[PDB]
Coordinates of C-alpha atoms and ligand atoms in Angstrom, one line a residue:
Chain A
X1 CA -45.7 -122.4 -17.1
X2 CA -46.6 -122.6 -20.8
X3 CA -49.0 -123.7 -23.5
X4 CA -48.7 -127.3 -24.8
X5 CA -47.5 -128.0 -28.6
X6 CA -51.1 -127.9 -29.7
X7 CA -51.6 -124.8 -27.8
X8 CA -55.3 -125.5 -27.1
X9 CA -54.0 -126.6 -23.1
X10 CA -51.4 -124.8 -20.5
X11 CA -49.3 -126.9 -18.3
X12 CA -47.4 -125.5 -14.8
X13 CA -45.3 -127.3 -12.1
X14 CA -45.8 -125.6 -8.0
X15 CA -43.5 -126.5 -5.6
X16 CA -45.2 -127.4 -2.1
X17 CA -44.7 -124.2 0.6
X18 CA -44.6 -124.7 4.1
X19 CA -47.7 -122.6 4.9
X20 CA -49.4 -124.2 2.7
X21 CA -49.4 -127.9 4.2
X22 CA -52.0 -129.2 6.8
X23 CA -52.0 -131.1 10.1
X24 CA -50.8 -134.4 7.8
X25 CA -47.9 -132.4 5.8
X26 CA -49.3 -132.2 2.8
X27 CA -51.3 -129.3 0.8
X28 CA -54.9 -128.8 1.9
X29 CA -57.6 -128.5 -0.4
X30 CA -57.6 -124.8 -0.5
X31 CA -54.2 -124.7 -1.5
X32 CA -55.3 -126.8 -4.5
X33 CA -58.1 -125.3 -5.2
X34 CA -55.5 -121.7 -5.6
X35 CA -52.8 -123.4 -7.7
X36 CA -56.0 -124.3 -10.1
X37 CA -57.4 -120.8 -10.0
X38 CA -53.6 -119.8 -10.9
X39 CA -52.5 -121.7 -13.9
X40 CA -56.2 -120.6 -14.9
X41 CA -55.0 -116.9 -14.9
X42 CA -51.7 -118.2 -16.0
X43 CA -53.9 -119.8 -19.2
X44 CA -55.7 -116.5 -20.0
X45 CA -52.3 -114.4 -19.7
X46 CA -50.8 -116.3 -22.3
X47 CA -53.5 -116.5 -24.9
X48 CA -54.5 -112.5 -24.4
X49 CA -57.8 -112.6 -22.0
X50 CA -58.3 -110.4 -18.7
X51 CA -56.3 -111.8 -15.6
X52 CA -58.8 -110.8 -12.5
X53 CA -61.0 -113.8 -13.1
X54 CA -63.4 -112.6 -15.6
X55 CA -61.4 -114.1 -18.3
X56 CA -62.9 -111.0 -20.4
X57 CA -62.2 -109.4 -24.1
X58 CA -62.4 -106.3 -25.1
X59 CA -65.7 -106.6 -26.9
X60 CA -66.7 -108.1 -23.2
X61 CA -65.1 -104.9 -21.4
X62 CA -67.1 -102.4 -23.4
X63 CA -70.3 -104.4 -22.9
X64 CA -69.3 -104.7 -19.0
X65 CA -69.5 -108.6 -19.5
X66 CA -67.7 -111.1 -17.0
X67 CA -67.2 -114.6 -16.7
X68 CA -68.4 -115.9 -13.3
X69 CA -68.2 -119.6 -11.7
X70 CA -71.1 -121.6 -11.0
X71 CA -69.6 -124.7 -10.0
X72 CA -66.1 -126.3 -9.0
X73 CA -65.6 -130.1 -8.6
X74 CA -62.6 -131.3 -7.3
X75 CA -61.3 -135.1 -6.9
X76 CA -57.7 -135.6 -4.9
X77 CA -56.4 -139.3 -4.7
X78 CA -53.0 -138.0 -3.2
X79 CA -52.8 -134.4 -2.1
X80 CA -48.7 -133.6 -2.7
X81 CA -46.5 -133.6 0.5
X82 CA -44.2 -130.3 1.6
X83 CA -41.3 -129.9 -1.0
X84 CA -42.6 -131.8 -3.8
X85 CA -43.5 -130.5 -7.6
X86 CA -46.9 -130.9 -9.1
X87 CA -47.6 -130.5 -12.6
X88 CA -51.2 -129.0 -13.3
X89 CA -52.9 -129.4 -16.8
X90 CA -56.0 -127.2 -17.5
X91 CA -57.7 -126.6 -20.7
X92 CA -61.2 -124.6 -21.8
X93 CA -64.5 -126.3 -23.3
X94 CA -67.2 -124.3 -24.7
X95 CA -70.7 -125.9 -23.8
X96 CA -72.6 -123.9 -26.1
X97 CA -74.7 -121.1 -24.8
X98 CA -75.8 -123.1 -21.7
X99 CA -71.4 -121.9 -20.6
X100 CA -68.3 -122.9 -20.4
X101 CA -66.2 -125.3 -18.2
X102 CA -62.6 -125.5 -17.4
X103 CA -60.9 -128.8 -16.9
X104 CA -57.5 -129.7 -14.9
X105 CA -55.5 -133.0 -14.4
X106 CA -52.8 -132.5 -11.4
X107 CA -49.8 -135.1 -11.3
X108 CA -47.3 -136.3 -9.5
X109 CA -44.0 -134.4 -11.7
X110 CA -41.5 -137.4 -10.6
X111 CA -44.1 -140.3 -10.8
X112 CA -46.2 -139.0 -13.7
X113 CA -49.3 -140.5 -12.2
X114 CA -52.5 -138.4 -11.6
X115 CA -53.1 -137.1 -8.5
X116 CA -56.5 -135.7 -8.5
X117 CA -58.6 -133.9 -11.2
X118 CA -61.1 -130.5 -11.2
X119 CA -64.3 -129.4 -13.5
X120 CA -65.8 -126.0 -13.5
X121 CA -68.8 -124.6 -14.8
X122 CA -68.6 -120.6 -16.0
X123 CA -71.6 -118.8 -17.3
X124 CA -71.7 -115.1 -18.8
X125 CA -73.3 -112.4 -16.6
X126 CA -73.6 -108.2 -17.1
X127 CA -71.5 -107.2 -13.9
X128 CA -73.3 -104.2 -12.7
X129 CA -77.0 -105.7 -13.0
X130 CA -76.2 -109.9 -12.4
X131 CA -78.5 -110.7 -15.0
X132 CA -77.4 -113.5 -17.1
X133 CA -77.1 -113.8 -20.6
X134 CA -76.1 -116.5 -23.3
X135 CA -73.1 -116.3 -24.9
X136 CA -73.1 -114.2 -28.3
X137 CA -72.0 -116.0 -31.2
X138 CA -69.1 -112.9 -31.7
X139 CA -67.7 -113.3 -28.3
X140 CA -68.2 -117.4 -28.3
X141 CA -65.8 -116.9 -31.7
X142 CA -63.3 -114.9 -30.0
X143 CA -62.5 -118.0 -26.8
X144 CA -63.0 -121.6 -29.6
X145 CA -59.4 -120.7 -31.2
X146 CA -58.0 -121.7 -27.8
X147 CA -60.5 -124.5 -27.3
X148 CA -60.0 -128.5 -28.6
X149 CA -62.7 -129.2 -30.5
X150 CA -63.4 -132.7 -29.8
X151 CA -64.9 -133.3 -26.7
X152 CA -61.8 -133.5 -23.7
X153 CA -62.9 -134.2 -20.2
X154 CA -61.6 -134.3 -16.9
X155 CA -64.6 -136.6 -16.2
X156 CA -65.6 -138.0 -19.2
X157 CA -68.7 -140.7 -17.8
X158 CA -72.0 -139.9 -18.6
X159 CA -74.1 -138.4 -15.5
X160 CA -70.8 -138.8 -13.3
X161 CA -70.4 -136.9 -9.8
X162 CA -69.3 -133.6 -11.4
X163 CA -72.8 -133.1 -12.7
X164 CA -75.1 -134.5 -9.5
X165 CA -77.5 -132.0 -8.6
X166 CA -77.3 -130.7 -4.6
X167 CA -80.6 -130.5 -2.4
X168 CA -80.6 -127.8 0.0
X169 CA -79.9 -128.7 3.3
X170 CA -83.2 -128.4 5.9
X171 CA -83.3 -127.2 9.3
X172 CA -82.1 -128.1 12.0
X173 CA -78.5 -128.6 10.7
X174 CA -76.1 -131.2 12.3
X175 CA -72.9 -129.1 12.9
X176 CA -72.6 -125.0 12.5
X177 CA -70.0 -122.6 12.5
X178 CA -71.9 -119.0 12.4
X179 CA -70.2 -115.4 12.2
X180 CA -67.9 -115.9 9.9
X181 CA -66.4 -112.7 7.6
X182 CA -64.4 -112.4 5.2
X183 CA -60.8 -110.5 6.0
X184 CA -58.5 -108.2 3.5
X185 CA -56.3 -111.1 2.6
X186 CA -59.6 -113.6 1.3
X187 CA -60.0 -110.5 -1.7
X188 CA -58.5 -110.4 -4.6
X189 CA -57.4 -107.3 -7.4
X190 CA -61.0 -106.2 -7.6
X191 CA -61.8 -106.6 -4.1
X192 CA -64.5 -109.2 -4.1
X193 CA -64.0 -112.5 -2.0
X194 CA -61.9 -115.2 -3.4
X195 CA -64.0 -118.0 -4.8
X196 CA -61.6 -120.4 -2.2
X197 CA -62.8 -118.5 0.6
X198 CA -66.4 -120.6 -0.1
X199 CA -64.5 -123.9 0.5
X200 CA -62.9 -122.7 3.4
X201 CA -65.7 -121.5 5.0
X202 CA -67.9 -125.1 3.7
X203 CA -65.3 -127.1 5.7
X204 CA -65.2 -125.1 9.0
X205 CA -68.4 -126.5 10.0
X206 CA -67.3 -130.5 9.2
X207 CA -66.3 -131.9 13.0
X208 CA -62.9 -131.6 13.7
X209 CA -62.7 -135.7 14.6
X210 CA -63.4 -136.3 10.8
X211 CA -60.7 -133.8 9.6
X212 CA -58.6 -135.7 12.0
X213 CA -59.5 -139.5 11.2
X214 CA -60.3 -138.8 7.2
X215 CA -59.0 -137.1 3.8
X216 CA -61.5 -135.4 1.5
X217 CA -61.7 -137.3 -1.2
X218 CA -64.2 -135.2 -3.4
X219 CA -65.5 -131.6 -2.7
X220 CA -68.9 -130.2 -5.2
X221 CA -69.2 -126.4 -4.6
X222 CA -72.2 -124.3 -6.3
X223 CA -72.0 -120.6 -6.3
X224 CA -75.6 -118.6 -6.0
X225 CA -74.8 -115.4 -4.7
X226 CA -71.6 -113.5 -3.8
X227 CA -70.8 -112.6 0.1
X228 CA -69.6 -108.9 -0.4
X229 CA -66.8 -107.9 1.6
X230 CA -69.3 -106.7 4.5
X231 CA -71.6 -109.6 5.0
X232 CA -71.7 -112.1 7.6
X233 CA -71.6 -115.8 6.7
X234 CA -73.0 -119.3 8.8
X235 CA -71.8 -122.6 7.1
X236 CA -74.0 -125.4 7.7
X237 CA -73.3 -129.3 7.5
X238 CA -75.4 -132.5 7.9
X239 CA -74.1 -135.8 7.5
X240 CA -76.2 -137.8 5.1
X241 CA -74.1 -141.4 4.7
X242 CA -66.8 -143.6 3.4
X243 CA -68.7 -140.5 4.9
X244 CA -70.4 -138.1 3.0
X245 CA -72.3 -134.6 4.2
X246 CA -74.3 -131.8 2.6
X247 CA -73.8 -128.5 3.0
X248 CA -75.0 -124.7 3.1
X249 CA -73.8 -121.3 3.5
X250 CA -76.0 -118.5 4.0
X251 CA -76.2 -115.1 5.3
X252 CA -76.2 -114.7 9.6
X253 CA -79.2 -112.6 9.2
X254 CA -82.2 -113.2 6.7
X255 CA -80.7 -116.7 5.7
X256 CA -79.8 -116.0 2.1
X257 CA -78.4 -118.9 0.3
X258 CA -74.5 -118.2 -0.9
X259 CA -73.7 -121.7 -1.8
X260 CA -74.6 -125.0 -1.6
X261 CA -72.2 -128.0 -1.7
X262 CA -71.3 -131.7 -0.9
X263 CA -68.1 -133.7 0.5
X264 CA -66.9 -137.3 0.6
X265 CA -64.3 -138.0 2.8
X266 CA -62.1 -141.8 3.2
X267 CA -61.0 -142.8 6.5
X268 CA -57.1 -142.7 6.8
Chain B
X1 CA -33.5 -122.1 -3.3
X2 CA -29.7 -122.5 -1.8
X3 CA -27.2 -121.6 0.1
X4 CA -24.7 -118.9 -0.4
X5 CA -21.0 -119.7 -1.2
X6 CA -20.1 -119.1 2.3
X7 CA -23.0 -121.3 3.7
X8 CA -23.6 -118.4 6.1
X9 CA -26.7 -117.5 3.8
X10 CA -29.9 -118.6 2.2
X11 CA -31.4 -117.3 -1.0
X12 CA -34.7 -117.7 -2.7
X13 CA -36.5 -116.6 -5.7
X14 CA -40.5 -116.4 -6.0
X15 CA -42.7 -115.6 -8.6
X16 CA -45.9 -113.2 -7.6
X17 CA -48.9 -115.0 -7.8
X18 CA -52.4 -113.7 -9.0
X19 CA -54.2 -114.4 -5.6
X20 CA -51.3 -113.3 -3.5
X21 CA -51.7 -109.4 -5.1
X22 CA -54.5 -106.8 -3.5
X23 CA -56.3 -103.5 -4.9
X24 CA -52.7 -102.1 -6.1
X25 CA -52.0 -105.5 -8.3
X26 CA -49.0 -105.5 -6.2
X27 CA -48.0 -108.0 -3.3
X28 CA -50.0 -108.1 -0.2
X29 CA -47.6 -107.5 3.2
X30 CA -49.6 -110.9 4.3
X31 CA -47.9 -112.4 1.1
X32 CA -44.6 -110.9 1.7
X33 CA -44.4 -112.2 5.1
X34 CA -45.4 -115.8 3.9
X35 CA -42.6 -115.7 1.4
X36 CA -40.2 -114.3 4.7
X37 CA -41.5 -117.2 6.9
X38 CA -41.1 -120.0 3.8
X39 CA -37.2 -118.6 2.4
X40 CA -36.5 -119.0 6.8
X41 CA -38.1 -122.3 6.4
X42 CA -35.8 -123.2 3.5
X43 CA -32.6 -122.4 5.2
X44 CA -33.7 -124.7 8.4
X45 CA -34.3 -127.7 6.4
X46 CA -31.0 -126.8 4.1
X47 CA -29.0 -127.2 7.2
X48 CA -30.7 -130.0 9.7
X49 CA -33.5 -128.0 11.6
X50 CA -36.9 -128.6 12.3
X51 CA -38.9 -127.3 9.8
X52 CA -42.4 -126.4 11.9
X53 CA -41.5 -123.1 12.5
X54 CA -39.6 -123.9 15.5
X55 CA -36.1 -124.4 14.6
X56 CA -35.2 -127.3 16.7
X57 CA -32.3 -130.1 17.0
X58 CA -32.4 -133.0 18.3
X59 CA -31.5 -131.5 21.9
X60 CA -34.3 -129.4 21.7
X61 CA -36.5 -131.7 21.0
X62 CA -35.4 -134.2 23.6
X63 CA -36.5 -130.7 26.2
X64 CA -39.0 -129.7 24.8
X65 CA -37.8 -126.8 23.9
X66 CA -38.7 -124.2 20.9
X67 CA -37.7 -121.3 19.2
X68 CA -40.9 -118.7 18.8
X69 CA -40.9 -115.3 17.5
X70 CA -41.2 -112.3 20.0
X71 CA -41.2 -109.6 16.9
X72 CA -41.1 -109.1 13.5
X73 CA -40.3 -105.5 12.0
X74 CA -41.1 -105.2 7.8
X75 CA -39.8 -102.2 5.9
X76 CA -41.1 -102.2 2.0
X77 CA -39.8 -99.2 -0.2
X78 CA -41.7 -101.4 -3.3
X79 CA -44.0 -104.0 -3.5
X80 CA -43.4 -106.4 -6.1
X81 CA -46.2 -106.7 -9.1
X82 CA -47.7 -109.9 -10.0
X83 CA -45.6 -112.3 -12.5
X84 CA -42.7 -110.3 -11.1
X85 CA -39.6 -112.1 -9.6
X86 CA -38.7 -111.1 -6.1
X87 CA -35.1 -112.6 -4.8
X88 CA -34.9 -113.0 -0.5
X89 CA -31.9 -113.4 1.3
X90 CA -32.1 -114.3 5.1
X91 CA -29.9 -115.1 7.7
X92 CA -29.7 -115.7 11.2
X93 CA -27.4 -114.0 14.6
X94 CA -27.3 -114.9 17.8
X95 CA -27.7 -111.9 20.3
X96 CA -26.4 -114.0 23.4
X97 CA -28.6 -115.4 25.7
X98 CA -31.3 -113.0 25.4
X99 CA -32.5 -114.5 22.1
X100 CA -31.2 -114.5 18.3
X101 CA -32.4 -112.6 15.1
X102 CA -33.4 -113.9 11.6
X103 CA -32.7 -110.7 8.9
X104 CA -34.1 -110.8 5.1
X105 CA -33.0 -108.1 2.0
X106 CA -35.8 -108.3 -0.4
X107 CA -34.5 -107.2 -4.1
X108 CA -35.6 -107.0 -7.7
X109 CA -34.6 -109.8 -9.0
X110 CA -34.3 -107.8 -12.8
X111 CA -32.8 -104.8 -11.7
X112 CA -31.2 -105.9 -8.3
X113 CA -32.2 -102.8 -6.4
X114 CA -33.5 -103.3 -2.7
X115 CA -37.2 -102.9 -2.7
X116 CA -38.0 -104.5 1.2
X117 CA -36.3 -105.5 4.3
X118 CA -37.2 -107.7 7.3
X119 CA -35.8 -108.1 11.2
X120 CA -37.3 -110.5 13.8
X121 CA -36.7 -112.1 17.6
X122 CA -36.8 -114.9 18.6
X123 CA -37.1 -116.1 22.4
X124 CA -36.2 -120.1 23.4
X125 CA -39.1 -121.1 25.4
X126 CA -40.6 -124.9 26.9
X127 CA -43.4 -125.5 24.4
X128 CA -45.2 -126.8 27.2
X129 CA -45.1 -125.1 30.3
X130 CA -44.6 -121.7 27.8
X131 CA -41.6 -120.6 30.2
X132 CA -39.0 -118.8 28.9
X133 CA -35.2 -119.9 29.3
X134 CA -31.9 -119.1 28.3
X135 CA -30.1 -120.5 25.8
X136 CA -27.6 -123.1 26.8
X137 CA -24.1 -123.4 25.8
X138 CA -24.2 -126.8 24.1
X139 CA -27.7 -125.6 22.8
X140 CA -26.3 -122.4 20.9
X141 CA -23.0 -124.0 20.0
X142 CA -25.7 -126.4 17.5
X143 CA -26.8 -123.7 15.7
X144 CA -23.7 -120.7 15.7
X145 CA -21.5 -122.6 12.9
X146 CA -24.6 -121.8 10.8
X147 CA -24.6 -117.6 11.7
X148 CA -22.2 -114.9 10.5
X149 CA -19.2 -114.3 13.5
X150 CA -19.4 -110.2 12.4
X151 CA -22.4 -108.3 12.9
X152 CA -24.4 -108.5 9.6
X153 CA -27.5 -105.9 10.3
X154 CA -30.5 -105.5 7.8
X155 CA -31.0 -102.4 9.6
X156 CA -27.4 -101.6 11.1
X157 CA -28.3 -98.0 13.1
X158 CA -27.7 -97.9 16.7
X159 CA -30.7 -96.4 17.6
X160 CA -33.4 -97.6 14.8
X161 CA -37.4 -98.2 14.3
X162 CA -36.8 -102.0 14.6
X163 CA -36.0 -102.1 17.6
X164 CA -38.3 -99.3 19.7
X165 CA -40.0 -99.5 22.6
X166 CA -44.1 -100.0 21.2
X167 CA -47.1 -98.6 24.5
X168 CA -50.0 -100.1 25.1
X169 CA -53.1 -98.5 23.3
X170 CA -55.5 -96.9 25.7
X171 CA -59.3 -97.2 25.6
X172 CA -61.2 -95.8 23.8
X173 CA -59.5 -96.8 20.3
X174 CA -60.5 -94.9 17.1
X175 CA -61.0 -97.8 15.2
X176 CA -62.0 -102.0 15.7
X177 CA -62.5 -105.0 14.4
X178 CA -64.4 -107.3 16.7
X179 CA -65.0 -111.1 16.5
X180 CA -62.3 -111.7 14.5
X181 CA -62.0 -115.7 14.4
X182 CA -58.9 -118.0 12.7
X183 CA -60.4 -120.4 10.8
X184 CA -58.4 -124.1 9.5
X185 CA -56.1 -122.1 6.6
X186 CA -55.0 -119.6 9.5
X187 CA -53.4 -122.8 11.1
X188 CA -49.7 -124.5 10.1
X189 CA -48.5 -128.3 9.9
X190 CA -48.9 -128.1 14.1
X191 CA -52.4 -126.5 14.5
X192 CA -51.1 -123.0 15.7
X193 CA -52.4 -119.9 14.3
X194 CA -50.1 -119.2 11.7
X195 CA -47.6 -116.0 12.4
X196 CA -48.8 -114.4 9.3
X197 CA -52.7 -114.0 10.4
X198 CA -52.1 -111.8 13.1
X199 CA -50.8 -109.3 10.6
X200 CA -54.0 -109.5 8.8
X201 CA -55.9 -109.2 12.2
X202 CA -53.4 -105.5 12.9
X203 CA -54.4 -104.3 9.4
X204 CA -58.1 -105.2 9.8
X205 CA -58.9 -101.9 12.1
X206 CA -57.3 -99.6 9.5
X207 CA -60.2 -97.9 7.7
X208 CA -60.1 -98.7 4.1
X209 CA -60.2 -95.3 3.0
X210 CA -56.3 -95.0 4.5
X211 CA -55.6 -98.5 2.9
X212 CA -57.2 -96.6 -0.5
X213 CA -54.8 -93.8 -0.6
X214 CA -51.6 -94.6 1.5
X215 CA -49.1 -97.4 1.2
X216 CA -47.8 -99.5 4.1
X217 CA -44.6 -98.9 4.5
X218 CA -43.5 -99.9 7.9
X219 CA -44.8 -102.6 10.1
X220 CA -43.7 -103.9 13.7
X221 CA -45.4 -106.4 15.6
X222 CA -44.8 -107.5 19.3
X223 CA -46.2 -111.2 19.9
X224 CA -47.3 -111.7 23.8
X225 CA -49.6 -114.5 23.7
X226 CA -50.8 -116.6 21.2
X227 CA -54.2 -116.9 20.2
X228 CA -55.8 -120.3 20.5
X229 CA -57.8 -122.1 18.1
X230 CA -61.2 -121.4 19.2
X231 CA -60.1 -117.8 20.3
X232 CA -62.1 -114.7 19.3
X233 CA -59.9 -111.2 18.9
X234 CA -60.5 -107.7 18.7
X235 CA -58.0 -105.3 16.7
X236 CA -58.2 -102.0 17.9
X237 CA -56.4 -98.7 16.3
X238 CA -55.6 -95.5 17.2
X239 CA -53.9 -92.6 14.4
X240 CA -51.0 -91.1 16.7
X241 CA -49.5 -89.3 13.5
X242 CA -47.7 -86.8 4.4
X243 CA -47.3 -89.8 6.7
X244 CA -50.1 -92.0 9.0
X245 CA -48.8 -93.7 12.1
X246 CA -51.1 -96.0 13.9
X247 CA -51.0 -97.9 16.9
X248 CA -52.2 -101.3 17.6
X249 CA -53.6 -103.5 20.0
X250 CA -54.9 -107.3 19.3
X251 CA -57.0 -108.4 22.6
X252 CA -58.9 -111.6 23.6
X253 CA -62.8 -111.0 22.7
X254 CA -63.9 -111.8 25.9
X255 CA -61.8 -110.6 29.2
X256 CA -59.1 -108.2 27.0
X257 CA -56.2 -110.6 27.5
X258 CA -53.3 -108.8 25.3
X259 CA -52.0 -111.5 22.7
X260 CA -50.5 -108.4 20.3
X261 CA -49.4 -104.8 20.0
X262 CA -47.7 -102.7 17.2
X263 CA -47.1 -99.9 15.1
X264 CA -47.5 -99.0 11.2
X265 CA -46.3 -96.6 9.2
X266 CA -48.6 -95.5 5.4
X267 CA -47.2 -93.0 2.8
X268 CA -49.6 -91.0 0.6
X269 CA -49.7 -92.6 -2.8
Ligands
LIG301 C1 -63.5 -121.0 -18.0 C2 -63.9 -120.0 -19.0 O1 -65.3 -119.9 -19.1 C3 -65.5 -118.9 -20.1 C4 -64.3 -118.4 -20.5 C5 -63.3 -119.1 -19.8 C6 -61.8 -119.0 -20.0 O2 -61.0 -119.6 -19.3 N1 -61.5 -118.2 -21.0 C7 -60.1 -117.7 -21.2 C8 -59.2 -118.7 -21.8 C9 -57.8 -118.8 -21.8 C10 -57.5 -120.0 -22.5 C11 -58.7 -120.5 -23.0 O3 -59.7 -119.8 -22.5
LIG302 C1 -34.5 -117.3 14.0 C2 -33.9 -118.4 14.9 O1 -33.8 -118.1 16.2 C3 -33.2 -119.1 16.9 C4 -32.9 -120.0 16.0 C5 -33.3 -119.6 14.7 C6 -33.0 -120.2 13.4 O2 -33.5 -119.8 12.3 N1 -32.3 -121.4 13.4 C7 -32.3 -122.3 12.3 C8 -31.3 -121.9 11.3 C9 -31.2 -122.3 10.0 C10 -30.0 -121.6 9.5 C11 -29.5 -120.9 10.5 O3 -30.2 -121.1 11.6

């Protein structure tokens, strides 16, 4: 991969694995949703920021300041098929001290058409205590050089999807998958649980007739609370239609909300 | 990736990703045996075969018979960094009508020095009746223009690691993991649980204060059974040993139905 001649976006082509195709031969969602999260760290290597997902400076590191996602949004219109080469675009938008998002534009490398598209939301927290904070105006200085200044957006409509706000789902719940936990290979560096892991664990309780009859079309994740590498999950779905469902992940025991989410899916 | 000059190889750079790395920033075994599986994958398709994991002709498929792996056996003197550029070479022997092997040499792509190597079985079997047979003739005549005529050994000692007898742990373990479940990314393109998760499920018993300060080194893995899609598992482990040895059992939740057992091998950091 590498920055763009403006340099204020990063560009990277993927070639389609094997293990990383579903029951229709093509990449699932979580294999998207990885490639995103990897020409994101590919984005901050080459610019100079942390790699681990923190996207952190030094002035951040001695503050013990990370960057932390509060929502993903992702649209696929063709997900790529075994063998073939996608190109991912992703850039960085400051949103003043509200956060940050992250944009990308995935294409077909031999067509040139786009495939799907992704928005992210980032705000700043202190690691240790969780307690947010609004971006200095030192360390907001430090991330705009690498930033287009006009406004450049994956979804550029006014009060589109990306931004909808997400009820909470109410008891009792349609479907259910309960006792799911995390395993060694869903951490990453720092050995908390991969933000794909969440969309994983969102989908297992979707029916498996409508993963078998329909593509997901659009997926709206919010992140509330981190599962720590000893919790116990139960992912919750209710169908509220195209079909479309709401969803909930919270902890087996005391029902502490993790995340809560949304999917549309086509029929084939 | 390509074929070697003599067509009797395959060869395959990758570049580590930042998701594919653990505590160490270094390549997960999970992530070097997906990389093993996808450079084997790479040489079917380069020649004909079936790319589901199966390794089929047209013959094969007509029977409906498969190719499925009995054992794997991974030995990693280093485990590649992320951004680094790990080369994989594999091949494939038949060992007559018992079954046939598929080798990898992992190297440094920069320096060219071996950091890893790889051995595995493979057992013909009807995909639906799960009986085993023997290979046919005109069924292993397909494939054997594709092999190496001399023996070509990633691990050529007579009487080596790869290829020992592993027992069956006894109760009570030292260590589990219980109600371990494969959810949708465990599964490939056909619905199975993937090869690769059962590793993970083996490694999930190890306490993490071994995974902390040792280093996997060695890694074999009898497959008896496969676990279904709404299976549960237990891993169980027992220390039998500088070095750790383990043993390991993977059982059925329920009635203790064996679907695994192995070894491991950790050096002290
Ligand atoms: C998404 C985000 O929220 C807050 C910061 C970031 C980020 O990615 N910063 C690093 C970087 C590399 C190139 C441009 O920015
Ligand atoms: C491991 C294995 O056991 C039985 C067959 C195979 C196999 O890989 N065959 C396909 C192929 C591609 C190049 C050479 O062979």
């Amino acid at each position: 991969g590498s920055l763009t001649e403006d340099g204020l976006s990063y560009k990277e082509k993927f070639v389609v694995r094997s293990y990383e195709v579903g029951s229709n031969k093509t990449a699932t969602v979580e294999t998207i949703a990885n490639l995103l999260q990897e020409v994101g760290c590919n984005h901050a290597q080459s610019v100079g920021f942390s790699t681990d997902g923190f996207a952190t400076t030094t002035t951040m590191r001695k503050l013990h300041l990370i960057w932390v996602t509060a929502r993903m949004h992702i649209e696929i219109y063709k997900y790529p098929a075994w063998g073939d080469v996608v190109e991912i675009e992703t850039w960085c938008q400051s949103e003043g001290r509200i956060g940050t998002r992250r944009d990308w534009i995935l294409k077909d490398s031999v067509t040139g058409e786009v495939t799907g598209r992704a928005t992210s939301k980032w705000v700043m927290m202190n690691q240790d205590t969780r307690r947010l904070q609004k971006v200095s105006d030192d360390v907001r200085d430090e991330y705009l050089v690498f930033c287009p200044q006009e406004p450049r957006l994956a979804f550029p409509e006014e009060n589109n999807r990306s931004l909808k706000k997400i009820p909470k789902l109410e008891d009792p719940a349609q479907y259910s998958m309960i006792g799911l936990k995390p395993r060694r290979a869903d951490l990453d560096m720092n050995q908390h649980v991969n933000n794909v892991t969440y969309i994983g664990w969102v989908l297992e309780s979707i029916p498996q007739e409508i993963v078998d009859t329909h593509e997901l079309q659009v997926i709206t994740l919010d992140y509330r609370r981190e599962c720590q590498q000893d919790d116990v999950v139960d992912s919750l779905t209710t169908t509220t239609s195209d079909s479309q469902f709401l969803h909930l992940l919270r902890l087996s025991g005391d029902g502490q909300e993790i995340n809560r989410g949304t999917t549309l899916w086509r029929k084939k």
